């Protein structure tokens, strides 16, 4: 018979919500969390095939992706991984030092928890339209509502359809996505959220590399490379398509006990038929070149050594949790046990077909002659094949409990996981298999104050396992971290604002920075060490002002991998921060208008492991603007302008290696329409 | 920091997660959408009234 307790568990300090996503209408989640703290996720540049970014240094799962949907870790093993547009998604949120043990087996540092679009009892009938610049053309439609009077049964179904034209000429982006949702809710205590996903990609975009020339150091010439550059052939195809199909559930008996259980069965597959540069004859790399040694030695600063790829990939994944929650108190001291089992398969067949050295001719860079090439081509002298067949099944069993005793919540849990690995080289026979055996736990103390104010300190660790492969069908070792996380939170009772800082000393081991030197079959070596503080600021000062900042520094270095020993890795920023706000014109002549601006500012990284060149820090400033249609009689709909780097600032990403640099995006316009009935 | 604060709530709504039933301190309204301050909440200050499930003290703001 109280008032009825409000929250006081730090929670959602980082989600971008669907009143958010329909206000920013990410082209892709690379943006959504574009603005939220320790991310960087304009680290691959101006590219939608994969959507990859580094929280406190390290990035996606075992390269691939770290990221949940869900629940469960996504999916994706050897660059047949899944990506999910935006106008699916609910809620998108990046949990930054996460303090349970169910992330146990995803990195101690970060992780962004996906989640889908649940069907709603109230009637939806959303219709969006949204174009712009580079033939840019995506139509949604979101369409759920109930389907009895008590609403027990409820639909939803949200789809997708956009084409676009890459930056990069002669690339072309096209993707089509349609996810049907149920949702059986009886009564209050029994939930069946039935969920599908159903996404084809004919054309991915575009995937290629430039040299360190054109891109970041004048060439020989003294100019530089144009920002739409695209190195590879005319019929450069990348196509991708995913399937998956799943539920959610959760049942609560007594007021004590509670039983939950997630489950998804996804078929992804892609399929690559690109070339792509590896750097200017110039290079420490070629060198053995043949067709670069026939040249003289002032011609092979300007033309560019390439290689090819043929692939083609099918994946079948199976995962499972199912937990129970035992919400009892012992003496003065209240619980919520957390008991669960998790399950996991995994199957890729690789068929995929390389191109070694001088597998390609060469590009003039002064008078590029992008033709078209037969991939079908096998010469043995230059090409190579790469049959392989991966297949892992992983089995963790995972206890946690959050004790809370008068204004101190301790979280506190363990995770004991079966991790078995076999790959298959259809080549030579080789049959290589790898059962592993990790406990991992994660522990983390705060104190909640009367106003907000929570200073909290924790330990993580994790048992990450590889999702890689290397040549020869080299199954990786899995990467165990461990990470000293403190920090105060301040999430306020009464006033709507938020700040929230921390620093973190995360160190996982067994990971890999890629390229062994020539191809990117990815290659093995030491340990990092990741020192940082990440700050937010999450506000709405006054009802029409909203305003959104963050500030991440970030220093890691190799530490023991003896060549690279005591080096940064290369596509991570020193310092780092953004910084947006928007105003809502209500109750006034233009009743309706919303003004939003912003910026985000990614300090110099560096582009190789050796250290050799860096890149600069640039700064990016988008604006956008939306007028509600409720002087026109329509509820709801509201016709919009996004802009993306506003001053069209040509900028270069990151950079792996010397012969391997990323082009900034352009200027981006779109005009959004999206009416709801 | 802000322009609101303790004094500026008006009313308070209710909303259920992990099956108990809380409460959430509203402020402003913005056609169907409150400016609930407890951010544990829904996520972001303004939130639909829909996450809710009974906004009772909210049937007065114009």
Same mark, same amino acid.
């Given at each position: 018979?109280?008032?009825?307790?409000?929250?006081?568990?730090?929670?959602?300090?980082?989600?971008?919500?669907?009143?958010?996503?329909?206000?920013?209408?990410?082209?892709?989640?690379?943006?959504?969390?574009?603005?939220?703290?320790?991310?960087?996720?304009?680290?691959?540049?101006?590219?939608?095939?994969?959507?990859?970014?580094?929280?406190?240094?390290?990035?996606?799962?075992?390269?691939?992706?770290?990221?949940?949907?869900?629940?469960?870790?996504?999916?994706?093993?050897?660059?047949?991984?899944?990506?999910?547009?935006?106008?699916?998604?609910?809620?998108?949120?990046?949990?930054?030092?996460?303090?349970?043990?169910?992330?146990?087996?995803?990195?101690?540092?970060?992780?962004?928890?996906?989640?889908?679009?649940?069907?709603?009892?109230?009637?939806?009938?959303?219709?969006?339209?949204?174009?712009?610049?580079?033939?840019?053309?995506?139509?949604?439609?979101?369409?759920?509502?109930?389907?009895?009077?008590?609403?027990?049964?409820?639909?939803?179904?949200?789809?997708?359809?956009?084409?676009?034209?890459?930056?990069?000429?002669?690339?072309?982006?096209?993707?089509?996505?349609?996810?049907?949702?149920?949702?059986?809710?009886?009564?209050?205590?029994?939930?069946?959220?039935?969920?599908?996903?159903?996404?084809?990609?004919?054309?991915?975009?575009?995937?290629?590399?430039?040299?360190?020339?054109?891109?970041?150091?004048?060439?020989?010439?003294?100019?530089?490379?144009?920002?739409?550059?695209?190195?590879?052939?005319?019929?450069?195809?990348?196509?991708?398509?995913?399937?998956?199909?799943?539920?959610?559930?959760?049942?609560?008996?007594?007021?004590?006990?509670?039983?939950?259980?997630?489950?998804?069965?996804?078929?992804?597959?892609?399929?690559?038929?690109?070339?792509?540069?590896?750097?200017?004859?110039?290079?420490?790399?070629?060198?053995?070149?043949?067709?670069?040694?026939?040249?003289?030695?002032?011609?092979?600063?300007?033309?560019?050594?390439?290689?090819?790829?043929?692939?083609?990939?099918?994946?079948?994944?199976?995962?499972?949790?199912?937990?129970?929650?035992?919400?009892?108190?012992?003496?003065?001291?209240?619980?919520?046990?957390?008991?669960?089992?998790?399950?996991?398969?995994?199957?890729?067949?690789?068929?995929?077909?390389?191109?070694?050295?001088?597998?390609?001719?060469?590009?003039?860079?002064?008078?590029?002659?992008?033709?078209?090439?037969?991939?079908?081509?096998?010469?043995?002298?230059?090409?190579?094949?790469?049959?392989?067949?991966?297949?892992?099944?992983?089995?963790?069993?995972?206890?946690?409990?959050?004790?809370?005793?008068?204004?101190?919540?301790?979280?506190?849990?363990?995770?004991?996981?079966?991790?078995?690995?076999?790959?298959?080289?259809?080549?030579?026979?080789?049959?290589?298999?790898?059962?592993?055996?990790?406990?991992?736990?994660?522990?983390?103390?705060?104190?909640?104050?009367?106003?907000?104010?929570?200073?909290?300190?924790?330990?993580?660790?994790?048992?990450?396992?590889?999702?890689?492969?290397?040549?020869?069908?080299?199954?990786?070792?899995?990467?165990?971290?461990?990470?000293?996380?403190?920090?105060?939170?301040?999430?306020?009772?009464?006033?709507?604002?938020?700040?929230?800082?921390?620093?973190?000393?995360?160190?996982?081991?067994?990971?890999?920075?890629?390229?062994?030197?020539?191809?990117?079959?990815?290659?093995?070596?030491?340990?990092?060490?990741?020192?940082?503080?990440?700050?937010?600021?999450?506000?709405?000062?006054?009802?029409?002002?909203?305003?959104?900042?963050?500030?991440?520094?970030?220093?890691?270095?190799?530490?023991?991998?003896?060549?690279?020993?005591?080096?940064?890795?290369?596509?991570?920023?020193?310092?780092?921060?953004?910084?947006?706000?928007?105003?809502?014109?209500?109750?006034?002549?233009?009743?309706?208008?919303?003004?939003?601006?912003?910026?985000?500012?990614?300090?110099?990284?560096?582009?190789?492991?050796?250290?050799?060149?860096?890149?600069?820090?640039?700064?990016?400033?988008?604006?956008?603007?939306?007028?509600?249609?409720?002087?026109?009689?329509?509820?709801?709909?509201?016709?919009?302008?996004?802009?993306?780097?506003?001053?069209?600032?040509?900028?270069?990403?990151?950079?792996?290696?010397?012969?391997?640099?990323?082009?900034?995006?352009?200027?981006?316009?779109?005009?959004?329409?999206?009416?709801?009935? | 920091?802000?322009? +609101?604060?303790? #004094?500026?709530?008006?009313?308070?709504?209710?909303?259920?997660?992990?099956?108990?039933?809380?409460? *959430?301190? %509203? +402020?402003?309204? #913005?056609?169907?959408?409150?400016?609930?301050?407890?951010?544990?909440?829904?996520?972001?200050?303004? *939130?639909? %009234?829909?996450?809710?499930?009974?906004?009772?003290?909210?049937?007065?703001?114009?």
């Amino acid at each position: 018979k109280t008032d009825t307790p409000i929250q006081k568990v730090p929670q959602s300090i980082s989600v971008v919500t669907a009143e958010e996503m329909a206000l920013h209408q990410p082209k892709s989640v690379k943006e959504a969390l574009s603005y939220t703290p320790g991310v960087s996720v304009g680290t691959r540049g101006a590219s939608n095939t994969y959507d990859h970014l580094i929280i406190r240094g390290f990035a996606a799962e075992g390269q691939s992706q770290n990221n949940y949907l869900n629940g469960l870790k996504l999916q994706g093993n050897f660059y047949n991984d899944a990506v999910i547009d935006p106008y699916m998604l609910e809620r998108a949120e990046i949990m930054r030092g996460p303090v349970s043990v169910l992330y146990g087996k995803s990195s101690p540092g970060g992780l962004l928890n996906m989640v889908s679009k649940r069907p709603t009892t109230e009637p939806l009938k959303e219709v969006q339209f949204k174009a712009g610049t580079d033939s840019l053309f995506q139509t949604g439609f979101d369409f759920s509502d109930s389907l009895d009077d008590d609403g027990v049964y409820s639909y939803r179904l949200t789809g997708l359809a956009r084409s676009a034209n890459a930056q990069q000429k002669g690339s072309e982006e096209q993707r089509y996505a349609i996810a049907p949702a149920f949702t059986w809710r009886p009564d209050d205590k029994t939930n069946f959220t039935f969920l599908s996903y159903f996404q084809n990609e004919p054309e991915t975009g575009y995937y290629g590399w430039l040299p360190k020339e054109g891109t970041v150091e004048p060439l020989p010439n003294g100019k530089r490379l144009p920002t739409d550059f695209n190195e590879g052939a005319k019929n450069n195809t990348y196509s991708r398509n995913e399937k998956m199909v799943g539920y959610s559930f959760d049942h609560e008996f007594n007021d004590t006990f509670t039983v939950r259980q997630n489950l998804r069965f996804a078929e992804n597959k892609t399929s690559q038929n690109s070339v792509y540069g590896y750097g200017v004859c110039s290079d420490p790399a070629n060198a053995y070149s043949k067709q670069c040694a026939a040249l003289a030695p002032a011609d092979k600063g300007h033309y560019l050594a390439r290689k090819y790829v043929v692939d083609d990939e099918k994946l079948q994944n199976f995962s499972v949790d199912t937990q129970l929650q035992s919400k009892f108190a012992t003496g003065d001291i209240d619980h919520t046990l957390l008991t669960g089992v998790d399950f996991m398969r995994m199957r890729n067949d690789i068929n995929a077909w390389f191109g070694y050295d001088d597998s390609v001719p060469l590009l003039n860079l002064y008078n590029p002659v992008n033709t078209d090439f037969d991939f079908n081509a096998k010469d043995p002298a230059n090409s190579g094949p790469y049959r392989i067949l991966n297949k892992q099944k992983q089995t963790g069993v995972y206890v946690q409990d959050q004790a809370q005793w008068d204004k101190v919540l301790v979280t506190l849990g363990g995770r004991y996981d079966w991790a078995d690995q076999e790959s298959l080289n259809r080549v030579a026979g080789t049959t290589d298999k790898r059962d592993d055996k990790q406990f991992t736990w994660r522990g983390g103390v705060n104190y909640l104050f009367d106003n907000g104010v929570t200073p909290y300190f924790s330990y993580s660790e994790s048992f990450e396992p590889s999702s890689q492969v290397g040549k020869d069908g080299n199954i990786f070792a899995p990467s165990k971290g461990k990470q000293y996380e403190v920090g105060v939170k301040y999430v306020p009772e009464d006033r709507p604002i938020v700040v929230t800082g921390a620093v973190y000393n995360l160190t996982k081991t067994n990971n890999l920075m890629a390229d062994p030197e020539g191809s990117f079959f990815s290659v093995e070596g030491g340990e990092i060490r990741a020192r940082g503080v990440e700050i937010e600021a999450k506000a709405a000062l006054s009802a029409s002002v909203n305003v959104v900042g963050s500030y991440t520094y970030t220093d890691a270095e190799y530490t023991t991998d003896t060549t690279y020993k005591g080096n940064t890795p290369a596509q991570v920023p020193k310092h780092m921060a953004s910084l947006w706000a928007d105003y809502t014109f209500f109750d006034g002549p233009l009743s309706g208008l919303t003004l939003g601006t912003g910026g985000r500012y990614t300090g110099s990284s560096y582009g190789d492991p050796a250290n050799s060149f860096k890149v600069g820090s640039y700064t990016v400033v988008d604006a956008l603007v939306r007028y509600d249609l409720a002087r026109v009689g329509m509820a709801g709909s509201n016709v919009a302008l996004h802009v993306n780097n506003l001053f069209d600032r040509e900028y270069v990403a990151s950079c792996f290696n010397t012969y391997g640099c990323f082009w900034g995006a352009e200027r981006q316009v779109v005009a959004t329409a999206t009416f709801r009935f | 920091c802000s322009t +609101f604060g303790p #004094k500026d709530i008006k009313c308070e709504a209710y909303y259920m997660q992990d099956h108990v039933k809380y409460k *959430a301190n %509203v +402020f402003d309204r #913005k056609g169907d959408m409150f400016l609930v301050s407890p951010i544990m909440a829904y996520g972001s200050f303004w *939130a639909p %009234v829909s996450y809710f499930t009974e906004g009772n003290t909210c049937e007065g703001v114009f």
